[PDB]
Amino acid sequence: EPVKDTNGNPLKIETRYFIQPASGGGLVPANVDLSHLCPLGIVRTSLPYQPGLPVTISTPNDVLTNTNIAITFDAPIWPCPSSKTWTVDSSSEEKYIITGGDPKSGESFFRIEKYGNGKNTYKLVRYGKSVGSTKSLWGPALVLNDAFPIKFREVD
Amino acid sequence: EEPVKDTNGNPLKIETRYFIQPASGGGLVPANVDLSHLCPLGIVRTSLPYQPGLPVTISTPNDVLTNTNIAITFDAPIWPCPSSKTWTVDSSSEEKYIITGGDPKSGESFFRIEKYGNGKNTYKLVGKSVGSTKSLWGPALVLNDAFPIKFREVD
Amino acid sequence: EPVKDTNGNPLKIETRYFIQPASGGGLVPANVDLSHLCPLGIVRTSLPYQPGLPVTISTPNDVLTNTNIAITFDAPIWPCPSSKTWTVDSSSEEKYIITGGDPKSGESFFRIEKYGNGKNTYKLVRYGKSVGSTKSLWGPALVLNDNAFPIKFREVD
Amino acid sequence: EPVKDTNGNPLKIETRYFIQPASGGGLVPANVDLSHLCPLGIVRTSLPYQPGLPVTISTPNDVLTNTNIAITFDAPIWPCPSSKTWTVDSSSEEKYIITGGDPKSGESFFRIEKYGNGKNTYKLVRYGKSVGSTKSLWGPALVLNDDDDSDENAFPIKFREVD
Ligand code: CLA
Ligand code: CLA
Numbered sequence A: 001e002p003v004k005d006t007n008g009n010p011l012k013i014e015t016r017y018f019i020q021p022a023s024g025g026g027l028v029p030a031n032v033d034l035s036h037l038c039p040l041g042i043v044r045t046s047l048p049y050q051p052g053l054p055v056t057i058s059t060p061n062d063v064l065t066n067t068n069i070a071i072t073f074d075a076p077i078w079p080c081p082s083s084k085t086w087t088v089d090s091s092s093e094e095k096y097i098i099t100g101g102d103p104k105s106g107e108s109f110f111r112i113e114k115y116g117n118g119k120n121t122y123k124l125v126r127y128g129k130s131v132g133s134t135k136s137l138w139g140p141a142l143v144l145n146d147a148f149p150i151k152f153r154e155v156d
Numbered sequence B: 001e002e003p004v005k006d007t008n009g010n011p012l013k014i015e016t017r018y019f020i021q022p023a024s025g026g027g028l029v030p031a032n033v034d035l036s037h038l039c040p041l042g043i044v045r046t047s048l049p050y051q052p053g054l055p056v057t058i059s060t061p062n063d064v065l066t067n068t069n070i071a072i073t074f075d076a077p078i079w080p081c082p083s084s085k086t087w088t089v090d091s092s093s094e095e096k097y098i099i100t101g102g103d104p105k106s107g108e109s110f111f112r113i114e115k116y117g118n119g120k121n122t123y124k125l126v127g128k129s130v131g132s133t134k135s136l137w138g139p140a141l142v143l144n145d146a147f148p149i150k151f152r153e154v155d
Numbered sequence C: 001e002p003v004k005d006t007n008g009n010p011l012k013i014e015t016r017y018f019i020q021p022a023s024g025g026g027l028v029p030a031n032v033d034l035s036h037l038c039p040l041g042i043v044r045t046s047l048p049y050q051p052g053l054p055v056t057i058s059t060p061n062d063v064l065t066n067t068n069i070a071i072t073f074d075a076p077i078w079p080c081p082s083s084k085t086w087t088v089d090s091s092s093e094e095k096y097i098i099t100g101g102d103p104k105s106g107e108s109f110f111r112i113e114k115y116g117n118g119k120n121t122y123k124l125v126r127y128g129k130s131v132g133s134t135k136s137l138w139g140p141a142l143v144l145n146d147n148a149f150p151i152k153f154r155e156v157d
Numbered sequence D: 001e002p003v004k005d006t007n008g009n010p011l012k013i014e015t016r017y018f019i020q021p022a023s024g025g026g027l028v029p030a031n032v033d034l035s036h037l038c039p040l041g042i043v044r045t046s047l048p049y050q051p052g053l054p055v056t057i058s059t060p061n062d063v064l065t066n067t068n069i070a071i072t073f074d075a076p077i078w079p080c081p082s083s084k085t086w087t088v089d090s091s092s093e094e095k096y097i098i099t100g101g102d103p104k105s106g107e108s109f110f111r112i113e114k115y116g117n118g119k120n121t122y123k124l125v126r127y128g129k130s131v132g133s134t135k136s137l138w139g140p141a142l143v144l145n146d147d148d149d150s151d152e153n154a155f156p157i158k159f160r161e162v163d
């Protein structure tokens, strides 16, 4: 079934959305620790009115639940030599969700699933392993569990 | 001596949060002016399109009126500099950067909101107006010898 | 008695020294945590051949043990609106040794004392409260104890 | 002929050296501008007594002049997903010397040549295009000159052994 935004409208591919915590402000690029600059991790900003860095969703025009999708940050500047596409830091113990994935490759595929109670609330799951958060340098950072509830706000 | 209006045409209120958005990239934010100064912070225009800016509250020494002494203070849950979030002029610098750390009750921190050019709800900060200069992180607010702004209410 | 450098020579005021851990490289400015940029703390660099940021010692020309001295970083550029003089962050729980002190004021007075093993090895003590270290953002940061952080003074050639 | 260090001793491969400006302190990693974090550029530190970040030299045990060598930073921490080996940023207009090269590949080969009068003073040349410097974010950054291999805009260097 269709993934809905905060206005209850269906999510469209190639459309800009803030991924906002459903449970501070939105989700943003920040480095995971002082040992890694690139690629970047995804942290919840502690600043109350910051909407997040927008993302576009792509499918290998509706975004449906339980289907393979790829999340890519939308930014006019990017200081890392790799992509803005979310992926899993396989090497790390923490299993941080990091940038630099290939949006056409399976290493970058997540699934948007419904999350408990409230409407328009979702979780990211990787194939069942869900995306959660861990305390890190800049605040809560997205990690692959062995769930971090999110909403999608349309960028007006 | 008429009311300053926000982007919705509503009058500005003191002790209310507003994004100061360029009228002319996203809103106005704290960033350091160059690699020689960390504190206090300057005010730069973010190059990221949907960043609203760091909110400010306006205070008067409840309406904010044009051509009256006001003080602009950043609203932030964290502040890593040992001084205030109140805008003021970096007197020492050649560039005359608008910097944080002013005293909101003191005259060193008084600006006046004046009408700018054509469009409604467009203003400037002032007979020396606030403009911008190229700096480290992008356009930084400076005192001229005008940088047009709108006030968006933080909903 | 005179404080000696790593060459066994007496320390002189207004002379540049690296304060090197006696126990990684020398002592350097870094911020203590992500909530404070200025003033700066003093951390031990984890990079093996970095000598530290040099300091000059001042007295309110010989530097003697158990006498009031003030430590001031020597740097051509300084991005904080305060001094390069070491002092104690009174407000913090950790009691970080921070920059921004007044070198003529008592808030900035430390005493160089002999430390245990080996010649030319010293500790900083504040009036007895000694200077130790704590884990912080960038690595071990100098703090005032209630574990003394042993130091040598290397002359800057 | 052998490249000599600041003590006049011949340079050895797999040995740590500070590359110090012959002409501020030594050469260090810093980003080139606010648009690039990785890979890193090479800047001259403006802090007088900072020796530089040490490098080891490798040859595809003596380091000789006018022979292909590769310069690799020696560092306990490295936050970029690529190597510590110097190479040329081909894409950039400035032609910054950047990290992330392959030390066994030709993209990373420099040649150490004599510079001017004074002994133990050298330049880096790429095959004749010499390494110079340009004003950048953190200070003078190493760049590849266009040059007919002269010492005019070449960035003169000494090698200090890390004791
Ligand atoms: C808020 C400002 C600030 C911050 C965050 C730092 C942070 C640091 N300083 Mg310091 N420093 C400052 C102000 C600051 N300093 C000032 C004003 C001076 C006088 C000019 C100095 C003089 C100084 C000296 C002489 C040295 C340091 C060193 C260090 C590092 C100690 C950690 C380490 O040994 O390995 C970690 C080191 C790495 C290089 C790994 C990279 C770490 C991650 C990816 C973050 C990138 C850091 C980046 C450059 C941030 C800008 C801060 C910059 C001043 C370093 C750390 C990067 C030591 C050092 O290591 O130099 C590089 C050192 O020798 N400092
Ligand atoms: C290495 C790269 C890097 C780093 C370190 C950061 C860091 C951060 N990003 Mg991000 N970001 C990046 C890349 C980076 N990002 C890229 C490439 C983009 C796309 C262009 C973004 C887009 C982005 C957006 C849209 C937002 C952030 C935000 C944040 C902040 C989240 C935590 C917070 O709530 O701060 C709140 C606290 C502060 C801002 C004060 C910080 C405390 C002091 C001043 C520390 C100063 C740094 C110190 C010297 C150490 C330097 C080390 C560093 C080199 C690792 C944090 C400052 C959010 C934010 O808060 O914006 C400011 C936010 O909305 N990011």
Ligand code: CLA
Pocket (backbone or CB within 6 Å): A047, A050, A077, A079, B029, B030, B031, B032, B038, B041, B044, B045, B046, B047, B048, B051, B052, B053, B054, B076, B077, B078, B079, B080, B137, B138, C037, D033, D034, D035, D036, D037
């Ligand atoms: C030393 C202190 C300091 C520094 C260096 C900065 C720097 C910056 N701030 Mg600010 N800020 C500060 C203090 C600081 N701020 C404080 C105390 C607050 C109140 C909490 C804020 C609140 C704030 C907000 C709300 C916003 C900023 C934004 C910005 C950016 C404006 C330029 C841009 O559009 O880049 C965009 C380009 C990038 C993010 C990628 C550049 C790659 C560089 C080379 C690496 C930079 C890493 C990291 C962001 C630097 C660490 C410093 C950190 C404090 C931000 C710039 C990165 C805007 C922003 O862009 O958010 C991130 C923004 O919306 N600031």
Ligand code: CLA
Pocket (backbone or CB within 6 Å): A037, B034, B035, B036, B037, B038, C047, C050, C077, C079, D028, D029, D030, D031, D037, D040, D043, D044, D045, D046, D047, D050, D051, D052, D053, D075, D076, D077, D078, D079, D138, D139
């Ligand atoms: C992106 C990563 C990064 C960045 C930005 C830097 C930047 C710098 N490095 Mg390097 N370095 C790195 C990675 C990095 N390095 C790595 C991975 C290593 C190996 C572990 C090193 C090893 C190294 C050594 C050994 C040395 C440096 C030094 C320097 C400085 C050279 C300019 C100078 O003389 O300042 C002098 C002036 C100051 C240090 C005071 C300026 C303080 C400013 C205001 C801090 C700015 C913070 C602000 C939030 C903006 C940050 C932007 C950032 C996000 C890009 C500069 C701060 C030299 C140095 O000077 O020591 C720190 C030095 O000796 N580097």
